[PDB]
Amino acid sequence: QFAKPEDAVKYRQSALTLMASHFGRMTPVVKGQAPYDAAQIKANVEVLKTLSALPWAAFGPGTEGGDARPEIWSDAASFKQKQQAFQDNIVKLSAAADAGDLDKLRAAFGDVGASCKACHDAYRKK
Amino acid sequence: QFAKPEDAVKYRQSALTLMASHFGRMTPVVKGQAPYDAAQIKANVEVLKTLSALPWAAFGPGTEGGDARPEIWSDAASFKQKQQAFQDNIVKLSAAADAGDLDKLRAAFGDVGASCKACHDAYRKK
Numbered sequence A, B: 001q002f003a004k005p006e007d008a009v010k011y012r013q014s015a016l017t018l019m020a021s022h023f024g025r026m027t028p029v030v031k032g033q034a035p036y037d038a039a040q041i042k043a044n045v046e047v048l049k050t051l052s053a054l055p056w057a058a059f060g061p062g063t064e065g066g067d068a069r070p071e072i073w074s075d076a077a078s079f080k081q082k083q084q085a086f087q088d089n090i091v092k093l094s095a096a097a098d099a100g101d102l103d104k105l106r107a108a109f110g111d112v113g114a115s116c117k118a119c120h121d122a123y124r125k126k
């Protein structure tokens, strides 16, 4: 759905802005600095789940640009792995939010953060 | 969830990038230039429905900036109307996509476009 490589870049940086907001806005709740309302978090995590599947389809062949390292494309199986791993971690977050269990949520949340960071360390330009 | 006014602006332009892509990518299908696969459109419209509720929460008080006219805030009831109208039009698109009826989809799609444009004409800076 992208007329030019720039349009895919702009889409994926857009989608990652939204995902980072929907994940990071929960930080105060995971830390106990903000109140935990199960319904409110369940809802926000559903939003995050839909957003978390969107960036990956905007690294199609020929969308080099942005801060994406070229190795996303020369090692596509490994990049595919990292994103499936991250998406599985979002499943576990969903399950914790759907269970309304804050301890489970905080552990899920740390696993999700580690997997964001694992991918950036291999595939996002310093 | 926004530390500064700029963060809300950046979030809402992000969310509208995504919504414009998920709506506009259907244009060739509504026109008959691309094939109509009901399941594929049903899915994309679900994505669009979640995305279409996201921008509105990022025009909270104090997030002036971007190409948002100040009248979004001095006339908040009317702006609220326009967005509820637009979101209702996305419900009708959903219903057409869920029914797998292309004629209904094309009509829904035109109604959705008109309501995007109606709001821009009143509240988006030329």
Ligand code: HEC
Residues within 6 Å of the ligand: A009, A012, A013, A014, A016, A017, A019, A020, A023, A065, A066, A067, A068, A069, A079, A082, A083, A086, A112, A113, A115, A116, A117, A119, A120, A123, A124, A125
């Ligand atoms: C690969 C499997 C990744 C996973 C998992 C996550 N991110 Fe990511 N991120 C990735 C790339 C290749 C890039 C660069 C994209 C480009 O073309 O520039 C990024 C970028 C970001 C950014 C900055 C983007 C911008 O606005 O230009 C942010 C804020 C970001 N990523 C956040 C983020 C979060 C919160 C994640 C888990 C919840 C996450 N990323 C996972 C690759 C990957």
Ligand code: HEC
Residues within 6 Å of the ligand: B009, B012, B013, B014, B016, B017, B019, B020, B023, B065, B066, B067, B068, B069, B079, B082, B083, B086, B112, B113, B115, B116, B117, B119, B120, B123, B124, B125
């Ligand atoms: C108000 C009720 C709106 C509705 C309905 C739609 N849009 Fe919108 N749009 C609105 C505003 C106030 C703004 C400016 C936001 C800012 O702070 O700059 C916009 C902007 C856009 C943009 C350009 C954004 C950018 O990347 O900076 C686009 C591409 C856009 N809007 C598309 C769009 C579509 C496709 C809509 C219906 C599907 C739609 N908008 C509805 C206000 C409103």
